[PDB]
Ligand binder design. Structure first.
Ligand SMILES: *Cc1c(COP(=O)(O)O)cnc(C)c1O
Ligand SMILES: *Cc1c(COP(=O)(O)O)cnc(C)c1O
Lengths: 273, 271
């Protein structure tokens, strides 16, 4: 393993030493966007797609990029080289100190945290997890912002599930997939964040001739479901056995979830950079 | 010279920093207040600090300092500024959400800045609001999350209008004047603004009828006047909401009257 690191103001620091000025509007106004990038075999997964989504997030938030993607990639690769071990990398783009008369954040800061990967406990893959449905949605759902406050305030659920007017969109942190009569159902990216894990799962489904519906699954359809799972770079495919007071299928991780997870882990090297 | 109280010291604001581990940075876990001065006395200090605790408590953040200590820090800071001051105390999540479902290592800092009232032209002409079909979740919490507020047509402020029901501004309480009545969203829906509270008490005193309901976007053609409220801006007239002019498109008689009564009455709530 290795010491957790933070790249900030041109230097790799011990994470515990990295500080941001209190003037930054990430602190005062929640103006921040970020990515989570994970390694397999010490290579970043979906590095260019994560970086393209980071720019996407900044641009949609009126934040000018403080560094080019080529620079971010060079910093991310140097940091993973310093860690010497499987790493979770989180680049952060801040608003910086001002919103100009031009309606842009033009003094954005950025920093990159490097940490050891802490996957969810293998028991949660064996037993599956519970989600808490709420009648709320993520606004600007293409933006991966730093605003997770609602995820904390919102029955021992692993994650809240945004279910506006009873349409399942996604988790606070994770893409949601439903399996009904061997089909994969997941919200369209008009409503859900364009997950990189979500994208890989959709391409594995295409390859394995599994039909995909890009529509919001309904809370009212959950009794008719066999399986469910949530996705994100660190968790991969995490089975979901319970949503509110509805058990999913027979209440244990299902056949198609475990299959797609195994295909994911066998296939993952194609998307490493 | 702007100051920031952090780790027991008043620093030049530019020198104050927070660790990047803090979940205010990583996860937007933070609450704050805006406290402003008249004649260098803090207005509604005790109500502001009560609402700060309310926001922290509702967000599962354990207060890192007592309200007596915050009040002491705020009063010393205003005294060091020696001008009319805007004060903003911030309570952060800190580095962890414990297995007890609490933020137990909260940090705090307090920013002191010279007060910047909106330009007197904006009081003379009034401002525009941009309506959005969105709402503030946990609307009684004054969180640091203003992402939506930034990101139309040089509108002063966005107006949360979920399903065409006007709730409030990103930063401000919204009041509509219709048939000489005052219309403002209930605190089931809108943040309990301190300025909002004082204006409702001035309406009671002046026998102006208040309806605590969400005014409808569809009612704005039938409205005479509107205004938004916040400690620094006081009552700021609103003459346009998207493409709808309010009344004759100028600050109205009742808005100006309530602003004058607000400025004459404000002594009673200074601390
Ligand atoms: C980051 C995130 C995800 C997961 O995306 P990955 O790229 O697969 O890691 C899902 N939903 C939300 C809301 C997220 O912010
Ligand atoms: C701070 C704030 C107000 C205004 O509150 P005052 O106590 O009058 O300054 C109104 N709406 C929201 C959303 C706010 O955050």
């Amino acid at each position: 393993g290795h010491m957790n690191l933070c790249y900030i103001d041109g230097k790799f620091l011990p994470l515990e030493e990295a500080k941001l000025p209190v003037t930054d509007l990430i602190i005062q106004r929640g103006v921040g966007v970020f990515e989570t990038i994970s390694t397999h075999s010490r290579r970043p997964l979906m590095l260019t797609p994560h970086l393209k989504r980071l720019e996407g997030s900044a641009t949609a938030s009126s934040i000018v990029m403080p560094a080019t993607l080529d620079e971010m990639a060079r910093i991310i690769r140097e940091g993973i080289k310093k860690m010497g071990c499987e790493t979770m990398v989180r680049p952060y783009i801040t608003g910086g100190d001002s919103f100009g008369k031009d309606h842009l954040f033009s003094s954005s800061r950025y920093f990159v945290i490097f940490a050891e990967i802490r996957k969810p406990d293998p028991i949660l893959y064996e037993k599956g997890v519970a989600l808490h449905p709420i009648n709320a949605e993520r606004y600007l759902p293409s933006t991966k912002s730093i605003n997770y406050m609602l995820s904390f305030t919102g029955k021992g659920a692993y994650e809240i599930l945004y279910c506006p007017e009873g349409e399942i969109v996604e988790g606070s942190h994770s893409t949601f997939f439903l399996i009904k009569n061997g089909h994969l159902i997941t919200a369209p990216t008009s409503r859900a964040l364009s997950g990189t894990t979500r994208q890989i799962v959709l391409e594995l489904a295409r390859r394995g001739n599994i039909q995909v519906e890009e529509r919001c699954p309904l809370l009212t359809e959950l009794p008719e479901a066999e399986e469910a799972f949530i996705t994100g770079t660190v968790k991969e495919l995490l089975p979901v056995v319970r949503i509110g007071d509805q058990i999913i299928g027979n209440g244990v991780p299902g056949k198609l979830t475990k299959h797609l997870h195994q295909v994911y882990l066998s296939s993952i090297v194609e998307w490493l950079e």
